[PDB]
Design a protein around this ligand. Structure first.
Ligand SMILES: CC(C)(C)Sc1nc(=S)nc(-c2ccccc2)[nH]1
Length: 134
């Protein structure tokens, strides 16, 4: 057993708060905000050796990242930014930093009770997204 055992599985979005304001702060345009904000993604997390894979499947986009903790990778996000990302484990929380165009956003994922809670921060603006097991 390991690092991210408690994250592994298939998860479904059940609530979102402040996501439009987070996307505004990130610089997402109107049409993408409206459509992306409607999405109810499933998130599929798996581990194979040192490689973690996170898939998001939704009506908007299907995305997948695979990474090793601490090791930077390039990501094209669901809203089409070209970012450089590094994901680490800090006290049991997966911390995902995305950098582009001199900007940065941090996405934290943690297990709380039977949920997976995702907190997305851009400057002073936070969005909280809660997932339950599918
Ligand atoms: C910002 C958006 C929704 C316009 S674009 C986008 N693309 C990818 S791939 N991932 C995300 C993402 C990942 C984790 C938490 C919140 C968002 N967003």
């Amino acid at each position: 057993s390991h690092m991210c055992d408690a994250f592994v599985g298939t998860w479904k979005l059940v609530s979102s708060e402040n996501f439009d304001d987070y996307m505004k702060e990130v610089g997402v345009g109107f049409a993408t905000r409206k459509v992306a904000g409607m999405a109810k993604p499933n998130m599929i997390i798996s581990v194979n050796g040192d490689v973690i894979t996170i898939k998001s499947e939704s009506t908007f986009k299907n995305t997948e990242i695979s990474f090793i903790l601490g090791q930077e990778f390039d990501e094209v996000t669901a809203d089409d930014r070209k970012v450089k990302s590094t994901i680490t484990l800090d006290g049991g929380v997966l911390v995902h930093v995305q950098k582009w165009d001199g900007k940065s956003t941090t996405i934290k994922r943690k297990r709380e009770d039977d949920k997976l809670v995702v907190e997305c921060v851009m400057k002073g603006v936070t969005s909280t997204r809660v997932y339950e097991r599918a």
